[PDB]
């Protein structure tokens, strides 16, 4: 409604939120709850847990201070993201020694 470019297509949330998502049905049903299988809740293997209903990219914020989620939209363009990282230099090694004693 507000950006005019597209509907949220991802969400980053606390572990507790995703644990709920993975333990419930998300499709249209009468009720649904059980052992969590829908998304990965294990950040060990991946931050990206899965896709909610085939519609949203679900990720885990492993450092949530308490418990929340953020939903947002990122389009095919790069400006149409709201936020952007525009590197000029990246992961460039630095190499030498201290000539006095040759320590690296």
């Amino acid at each position: 409604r507000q950006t005019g470019r597209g509907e949220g297509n991802f969400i980053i949330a606390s572990r507790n939120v995703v644990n709920v998502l993975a333990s419930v049905d998300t499709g249209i049903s009468y009720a649904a709850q059980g052992l969590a299988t829908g998304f990965s809740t294990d950040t060990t293997k991946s931050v990206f847990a899965g896709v909610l209903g085939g519609k949203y990219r679900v990720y885990i914020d492993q450092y949530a201070k308490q418990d929340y989620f953020t939903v947002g939209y990122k389009g095919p363009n790069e400006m149409d993201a709201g936020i952007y990282y525009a590197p000029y230099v990246a992961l460039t090694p630095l190499r030498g020694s201290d000539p006095k004693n040759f320590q690296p």
Partner: peptide, 14 residues
């Protein structure tokens, strides 16, 4: 003379 990273124009609704 900064680089131009692109431009955006407001989208047209259907």
């Amino acid at each position: 003379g900064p680089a131009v990273m692109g431009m955006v124009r407001r989208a047209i609704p259907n």
